[PDB]
Design an enzyme around this catalytic site. Structure first.
Site, mmCIF file in Angstrom:
data_model
loop_
_atom_site.group_PDB
_atom_site.id
_atom_site.type_symbol
_atom_site.label_atom_id
_atom_site.label_comp_id
_atom_site.label_asym_id
_atom_site.label_seq_id
_atom_site.Cartn_x
_atom_site.Cartn_y
_atom_site.Cartn_z
ATOM 1 N N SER A 141 0.983 -1.324 -0.143
ATOM 2 C CA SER A 141 -0.062 -0.048 -0.125
ATOM 3 C C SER A 141 0.891 1.262 -0.122
ATOM 4 C CB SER A 141 -0.944 -0.215 1.180
ATOM 5 O OG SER A 141 -1.742 1.070 1.351
ATOM 6 N N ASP A 249 -7.173 -2.322 -7.963
ATOM 7 C CA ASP A 249 -7.018 -2.336 -6.571
ATOM 8 C C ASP A 249 -8.010 -1.357 -5.910
ATOM 9 O OD1 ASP A 249 -5.784 -0.653 -4.271
ATOM 10 O OD2 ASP A 249 -4.227 -2.048 -4.687
ATOM 11 N N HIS A 298 -6.780 -5.503 -2.125
ATOM 12 C CA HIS A 298 -5.702 -4.218 -1.757
ATOM 13 C C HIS A 298 -4.714 -5.019 -0.765
ATOM 14 C CE1 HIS A 298 -4.255 -0.349 -1.164
ATOM 15 N NE2 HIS A 298 -4.454 -0.225 -0.011
#
Ligand SMILES: *[C@@H]1O[C@H](CO)[C@@H](O)[C@H](O)[C@H]1NC(C)=O
Ligand SMILES: [Cl-]
EC number: 3.1.1.98
Length: 349
Positions: A141, A249, A298
């Site tokens: 991330s 995503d 994610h």
């Protein structure tokens, strides 16, 4: 054999609230491999925004809640069942407490992401890293984007400091975004409403953010925000970098102002979503080592179930193993071609 917390000795390198920053370490004396993981979890791009994050996510702006030990998961796990090729490595988990996508070099909040990394590396040299053969800087991330922003500075740092045998490499998970136009424009009021471009432009100046030297020199003074976007910064990097990226995503969709219910999807949005996958595939075409499944999700690399997803019959741990071998039958470039999330049956839920 949990990873163990050490707070930085240079007390002036701090989380947002002024508490000392730090890192968790599990030593493995028989291994010459180091895995340094950057935690992710969004960012804040002005004072009001950070105040709001302070009230709903205080743990990401401070060290005061960190336990003294933590169990490694996914790629940080010491269990071969969970980490079949890298379980014996030296494991480092750097918590994300700077809200600045690991770019900060700065009463007020402090933003020292890039300084924190610099300092961790310095300290790890006294705790075994000086004998390393491979240093993999990994992240998920915001930590993924952080890898792209820092991997070459780390390589240069170690060379400057006289450790030229350490091979620095990057692993960027869910950090490869498109500075695209939203599905529907919304004024930059929140972190979730805010277009990718605007978030970063505002953030960089607020953080005193820094970007890789060579990417900096590819854009105009003040336009350093470009280097936050993987497809723009990637070609400027010298270190080898493996890119793990879901084609759809959730954070990309969130910043694009796409909010999926359980409902049937409209025409306008099917074209949008499908075109997202297409543009993402196109950017990855140039990346020789990549793993990009057609799933709506994610992050993955420190989830325990990271061993389960497959692209064209190959698992992510195996792809990374094949990438190790290529740098020292075994594919390294694994991009799903199917056009819609969950067309791959091994997607998580
Ligand atoms: C400690 O960290 C601060 C904040 O970045 C830095 O300015 C200072 O030079 C550091 N001190 C030492 C001894 O490295
Ligand atoms: Cl200890």
């Amino acid at each position: 054999e949990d990873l163990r917390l050490h707070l930085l000795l240079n007390t002036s390198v701090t989380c947002n609230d002024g508490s000392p920053a730090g890192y968790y370490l599990k030593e493995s004396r028989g291994s010459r491999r180091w895995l340094l993981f950057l935690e992710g979890g969004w960012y804040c791009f002005n004072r009001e925004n950070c105040d709001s994050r302070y009230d709903t996510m205080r743990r990401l702006m401070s060290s005061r809640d960190w336990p003294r030990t933590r169990t490694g998961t996914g790629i940080l796990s010491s269990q071969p069942e969970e980490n079949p090729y890298w379980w014996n490595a030296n494991m480092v988990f750097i918590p994300y407490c700077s809200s600045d996508v690991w770019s900060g070099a700065s009463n007020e909040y402090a933003f020292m992401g890039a300084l924190i990394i610099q300092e961790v590396v310095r300290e790890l040299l006294g705790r075994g890293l000086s004998g390393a053969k491979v240093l993999l800087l990994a992240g998920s991330s915001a930590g993924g984007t952080g890898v792209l922003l820092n991997v070459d500075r780390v390589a240069e740092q170690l060379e400057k400091l006289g450790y030229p045998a350490i091979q620095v490499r990057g692993l960027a998970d869910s950090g490869w975004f498109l500075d695209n136009k939203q599905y529907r424009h919304t004024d930059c009021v929140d972190t979730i409403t805010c277009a990718p471009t605007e978030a970063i432009r505002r953030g960089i100046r607020y953080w005193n953010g820094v970007v890789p030297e060579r990417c900096r020199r590819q854009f105009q003074e003040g336009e350093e925000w470009n280097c936050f976007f993987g497809y723009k910064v990637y070609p400027t990097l010298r270190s080898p970098v493996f890119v793990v990226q879901w084609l759809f995503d959730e954070a990309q969709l969130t910043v694009d102002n796409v909010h999926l219910t359980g409902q049937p999807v409209q025409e306008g949005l099917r074209l949008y979503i499908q075109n997202l996958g297409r543009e993402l595939r196109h950017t990855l075409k140039d990346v020789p080592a990549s793993f990009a499944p057609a799933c709506l999700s994610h992050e993955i690399i420190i989830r325990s179930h990271w061993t389960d997803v497959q692209v064209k019959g190959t698992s992510l741990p195996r792809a990374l193993h094949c990438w190790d071998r290529s740098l020292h039958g075994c594919p390294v470039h694994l991009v799903d071609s199917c056009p819609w999330p969950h067309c791959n049956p091994s997607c998580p839920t």
